[PDB]
Ligand binder design. Structure first.
Ligand code: ATP
Ligand code: ATP
Lengths: 302, 302
């Protein structure tokens, strides 16, 4: 029903605060925006699959197992015999969070052969990554997939901009992103990204819907000429790490379930799911359907 | 006086038992045989340098700093503007130790332009690993360097066989190892490595001295046809992880200090350093000079 295609990797999360240079301990967890959204969609009660590529190693097996536990279809996840599973060391704490991502990994080495078309086509909504586009052959491969299915399925794109991933090739970045946006019916981006990109002559807009996140403050929806600000519900945030992908998961589930872009319904659903997710720890903080039924906002969609 | 050239990387050590797939926590430490030996040499009171390459990232800075605290000369460690610092996830525990090494990293990307010849000009002994030979351009860069210095500095080679690093290129492995051995005045290898290579038709012996390790049973020193068996000191091992590199550091310092090749003195000094290193944890377990003066076998050499 809903399929995601993009980076699937291991997050080595710093246990203590400090620069990556000084951090002594790391805790491993499954990561990758597309995979995080795929799990969120699954927890919302919607069948979901992930098309990605991991290495034929212990980390690869771990990721497939963890996704399997969340009920995400992994049949579309290929194992690479040359490249090892993706990894990124992260420091989520402090005033200036940082990361060290290793790019010669399996998810950046996808080829058309690696794509399971039966799955990408059965889906009503196809969500693809921005990070996955920083390196070929995955870039070419993904752009080819999105262009091919366009029109047959709704396309969703989260800008999720990472400048460090395009150093020395920013021009190409502008092209790839602009091209991606133009293919997406549903586009998600933080206000910062929106600003940074328009300042490059790039319009951050989805042909069907645009969702601009405004941090803990809230989000904003744009339908044609209609602009709606949605303040965030009150919560005593435990961890907002997964808020972005939880928000995206809810947004794609809401669109799927609600015939007619009722931004009021949709807006309330995403706000609810995103806010509540700040109660869970980690990259997969999307609340389960069984927990959202108590709310009228969710009952509408779910 | 003593220079090491080879791999320098971050060891992500599993804090708990289990397959890497299930390990949750990893503790980061400096690793790499040549780096480990350089530290051991420095601790024994001899000035040592390391020629290697790390990425221009937090982990690269970490490694350079840790080596500097050990007084190892780091001028010969270059920063790669593209490739990231080497990393290896390791499970040292259990009966079946395992690891996951990422190969497209800085130390495997060394070119002749990365070689600080001055540091190489000073060295009376140059130590290099076989792991660094696993990939080009570093393999050719290292082979060329050692070939040029041959006859000006004593050459030391620790076979340190890691078959997983040569899958698909085992024939080449046999050729490079043999070339490296024939280029070395000093060769170190485990009995297991000696048998594997002899069976491959390769003779494991240095032109000046050969040290065959028998693990906890001690080692064997060989010059020409004069053999000297050195049984292990009687100790209760706490951690043998760094014993090999501690042994190599002692062997080189001994050769540098002791007038002739008195195998008895050399054997006693190396044995003492190795045994005591088993009392310290981690890859850098070589005892410091200050902790050795109270030993007769050490006073001579030191
Ligand atoms: N403390 C909070 N209380 C209520 N809702 C929140 C809170 N934090 C985040 N949210 C909701 O989740 C959405 C996610 O916001 P966040 O600041 O994580 O941006 P994002 O879209 O994840 O950006 P990025 O791509 O940089 O991670 C917000 O727009 C907001 O509505
Ligand atoms: N239990 C022990 N008691 C005393 N000495 C030991 C013990 N274990 C190792 N050693 C000393 O340290 C030296 C290092 O040998 P070790 O068995 O660690 O192999 P190695 O040369 O390090 O190879 P590898 O890379 O496979 O570890 C030995 O030759 C020995 O003298």
């Amino acid at each position: 029903l809903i399929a995601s295609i993009g980076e699937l990797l291991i997050d080595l999360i710093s246990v203590e605060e400090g620069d990556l240079k000084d951090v002594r301990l790391f805790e491993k967890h499954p990561g990758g925006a597309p995979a995080n959204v795929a799990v969120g969609v699954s927890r919302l009660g919607v069948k979901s699959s992930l098309i990605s590529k991991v290495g034929n190693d212990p980390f690869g097996e771990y990721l497939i197992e963890e996704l399997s536990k969340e009920n995400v279809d992994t049949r579309g996840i290929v194992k690479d015999e040359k490249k090892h599973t993706g990894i990124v060391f992260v420091q989520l704490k402090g005033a200036s969070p940082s990361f060290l991502l290793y790019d010669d990994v399996a998810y950046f080495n996808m080829t058309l052969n690696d794509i399971n078309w039966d799955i990408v086509e059965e889906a009503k909504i196809v969500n693809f990554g921005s990070v996955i586009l920083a390196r070929n052959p995955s870039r070419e491969t993904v752009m080819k997939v999105i262009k091919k299915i366009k029109g047959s399925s709704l396309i969703a794109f989260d800008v999720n901009l990472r400048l460090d991933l395009w150093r020395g090739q920013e021009e190409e970045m502008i092209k790839v992103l602009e091209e991606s946006i133009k293919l997406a019916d549903i586009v998600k981006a933080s206000e910062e990204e929106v600003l940074y990109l328009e300042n490059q002559g790039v319009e951050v807009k989805g042909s069907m819907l645009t969702a601009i996140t405004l941090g803990p403050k809230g989000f904003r929806l744009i339908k044609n000429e209609t602009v709606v600000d949605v303040p965030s519900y009150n919560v005593n945030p435990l961890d907002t790490t997964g808020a972005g992908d939880a928000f995206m998961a809810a947004l794609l589930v809401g669109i799927l379930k609600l015939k007619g872009l009722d931004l009021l319904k949709l807006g309330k659903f995403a706000n609810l799911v995103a806010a509540l997710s700040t109660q869970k720890r980690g990259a997969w903080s999307t609340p389960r359907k069984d927990e959202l039924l108590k709310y009228k906002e969710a009952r509408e969609v779910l």
